[PDB]
Design a binder for this molecule. Sequence first.
Ligand SMILES: Nc1nc2c(ncn2[C@@H]2O[C@H](COP(=O)(O)OP(=O)(O)OP(=O)(O)O)[C@@H](O)[C@H]2O)c(=O)[nH]1
Length: 1073
Amino acid sequence: GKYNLILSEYLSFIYNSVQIPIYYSSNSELENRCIEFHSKCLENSKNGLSLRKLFVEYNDVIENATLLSILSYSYDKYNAVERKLVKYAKGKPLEADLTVNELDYENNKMTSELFPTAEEYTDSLMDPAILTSLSSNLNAVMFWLEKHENDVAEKLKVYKRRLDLFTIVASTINKYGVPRHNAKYRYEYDVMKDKPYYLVTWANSSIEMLMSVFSHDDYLIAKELIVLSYSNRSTLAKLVSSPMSILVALVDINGTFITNEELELEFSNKYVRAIVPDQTFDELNQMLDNMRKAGLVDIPKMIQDWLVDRSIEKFPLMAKIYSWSFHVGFRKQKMLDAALDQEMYREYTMLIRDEVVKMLEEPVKHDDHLLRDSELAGLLSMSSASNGESRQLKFGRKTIFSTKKNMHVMDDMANERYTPGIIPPVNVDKPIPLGRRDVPGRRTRIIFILPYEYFIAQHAVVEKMLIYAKHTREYAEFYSQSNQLLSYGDVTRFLSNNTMVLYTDVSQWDSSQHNTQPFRKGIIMGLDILANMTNDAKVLQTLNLYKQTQINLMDSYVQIPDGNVIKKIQYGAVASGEKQTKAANSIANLALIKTVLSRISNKHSFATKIIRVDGDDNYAVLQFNTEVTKQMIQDVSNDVRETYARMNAKVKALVSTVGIEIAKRYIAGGKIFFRAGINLLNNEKRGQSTQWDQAAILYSNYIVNRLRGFETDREFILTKIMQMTSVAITGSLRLFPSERVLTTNSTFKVFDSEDFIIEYGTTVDEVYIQRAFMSLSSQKSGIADEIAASSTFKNYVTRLSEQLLFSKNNIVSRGIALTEKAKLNSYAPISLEKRRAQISALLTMLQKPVTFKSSKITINDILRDIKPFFTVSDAHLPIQYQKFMPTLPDNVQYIIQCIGSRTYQIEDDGSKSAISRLISKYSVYKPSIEELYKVISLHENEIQLYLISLGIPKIDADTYVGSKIYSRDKYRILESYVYNLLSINYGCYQLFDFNSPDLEKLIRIPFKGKIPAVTFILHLYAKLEVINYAIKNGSWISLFCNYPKSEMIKLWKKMWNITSLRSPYTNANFFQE
RNA sequence: UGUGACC
Ligand SMILES: Nc1nc2c(ncn2[C@@H]2O[C@H](COP(=O)(O)OP(=O)(O)OP(=O)(O)O)[C@@H](O)[C@H]2O)c(=O)[nH]1
């Protein structure tokens, strides 16, 4: 409940020259008392009278009613920031050392010196691209500095470490003034011409870093990074994190977790000696020297101190630095420079070709329907992203322009222009438009925005490849329902004194031109073999068109902007934008390592315990018939790099016996770590989400970092959410939503009142509001209706339906209509009509919560029903599992030490239900978990129709609608649907073993019937309540259930009429991965 | 309609 209090201290801090608390109640009488109170407050304020008396008079409203929002009548002129900042600007400003960066524009020169004229200006190289101002970030940091002004002991030492760092930011800013943003949170030329180009973005990164400072070590790290980053905008992060790839090979393993035959973590008390050849030490020194040469002093010393003993117990500091390096910001270069960097492959191509065959051999031989109707599959999978060119489009009676793929496909069909039989060229005549990928620390990479003929031609085939990977272990990122803990356990498994692990970053090879030939060629060579495996006209064409995308790309040309011009240059490298990007890259990276290992075997004899490809890295674990020595490592290592060298691949290749470090994860001293470097106050690019959506994403980002090891003060995050979620009524009237409004599980939820704990309404007022917010969840869009009525549109839907099903549609047809009406959301005009409506609705809602005919059931109600039938009692769970993920907070780690962890994802889509598999054997359709949910609950006769309507043959449609399997699917679907509504795969929960024997102990559930659905939810509701109590209290409880039998039948019914909820919080989770 | 692929 502390959010609602912190909110006022904030407004009372920002504004000084009124606040009007607005309450509400599910109880009639009390509500009028709220209504009255509101009035009297406005009136008294409109007379400069003290509200102190009303607060006493309506003491009842302050005590029993629920705080809905807070009115903020502030009369100034968005200044204050200017004023407030001086106090902290006493230090000497920083002076950009314009000699640190290669490309001239990467140096913090004065904006003007980079863009002499307003027409040459572009924020494209510094745009924070976030819907929150620098002005407000500042305000937020001072608000906090004030609140913790009179702190003591250690808390003060945190303030003191921060007070300093913030001076640097303040001093340096004051020297130029505070950059003012516009309605779109953009920094324009007039305001930027004076100040250093990178002023704003650097401010954002520095503030975000200083606010995540606690220990003296944080302070030392923030300080350095904040100072060097004001001048270095291109190698800092790579410099500060490069060492980490060597450090993991130093720490000794004294007990670690491994993967067993049941694919689950299991403790192994073993010892593995870290064996490091001297040469490695030179490499690490050159890296430490390089850091030094760039100004770095403190950070290098820290790694140097740690290097005396190299204890996994003091390693935490090394990982802290590794995660901090990223908070410097994104390296945003110019499209041109980004694109500018770009006989013994016989073995390498042969592998790509064979691997491509293995994945489609069966599918092709058996005339897989997916492959036959590949084109139709491509259409249903189509997104609403860019096609490349902004086309003029006529809908109904409106001529509008769009670049959207979903739009171009419709318009093109309605004019005989739709022709997926012909795969457009991407050469000099039709140059590929470009997109960009920005990341912190690494160089910018370009992206192909190919025409839709390319997606359709690849979609089906790629999906068959991803399936082969799903059950192939070499493909770490696609195998089973596995999470990262499984990959962690696979490495540590064979680690012993007679084996060495070999990790390798191959990100530079994928972009190499030396690669583009063996690649495309290898695939094409495979597609040919596959074609000689069938005679199916459908299969050969879908397979042929795929061959065409590879040939058109062999010699592609690109449209690289160079100011305000678009130069067309011949691109001879494999960029990414295809449907096969990830799959193909995985196939390639794997073929590569297989080639290297095979070559080096001619010298040394080893055993291949495991080979793995995961993203832009690949690794292996080798076993020798003798004990490994520092000299054996050196020899293997040299021969490996040498092998990679003869292939002209600039890659990082290290060899150790204890750890590995790759982009997604790194294993030091038998433990697992995940870089905690998601930026907070700077984004890669601008999307179309709202501020509210961004508030939730910030919090979501806060959570993941926090779990990963980088914690940013929760009071700062909360402050940011107050700013971003506010809504202006006028110029002097700003509305701030209450904790109840922002944390309740509704369509407007932004974060959990308590970290790692998702609450659900357990009071009438909470329920009251919960139902209200839903009343206005989806808003209308005139523009969207118009186009949803246009011929070109209805014909598209209709044409898609007539190709898919045979008998009648409706359930499915109503789906295809909407799925298409939604894709029109990427189209800004529609996106804007929506928001505007949401704001007005939300404006009148936080002013007098409307009514609602409810009649809709949500997971909240189900739980609110159950709650009353459980008896709690103090219990005890000893800690038994050793920590394998060191950075986890303490309250989250405790849970795992008691109940354990898991290495899988709980099926939450229903893809494992027989019906879903049935519909897959005969249809290209893909029903969602929510559609399966409604379908499976229909009358037997109706299900039989749905199946046959989608192409499922009667013998099968009938053999199912009765069988034991059907009755089963019913349970498994609901089970999958519920795990989905509870976010059992996100946040903290994704870590916990919900089937832990230890946890099951604390749940006592006497069966008073035997009706699966009810038994399921009662157990889950208990497991969640028990875990939440532990997350918040550090102790355990036992839950006893005495749920009536007469009640179980009522519940069972509610269960099948649950409604899913959509919200920023919900969408934030999906946005994660 | 300051917008920029696969997922
Ligand atoms: N910062 C600030 N703004 C005020 C104050 N009083 C009124 N405002 C209004 O808030 C605006 C301040 O500039 P903005 O950039 O829009 O700041 P904001 O809209 O309040 O919040 P952000 O967009 O996150 O910065 C002005 O347009 C004023 O109309 C005040 O005391 N401080």
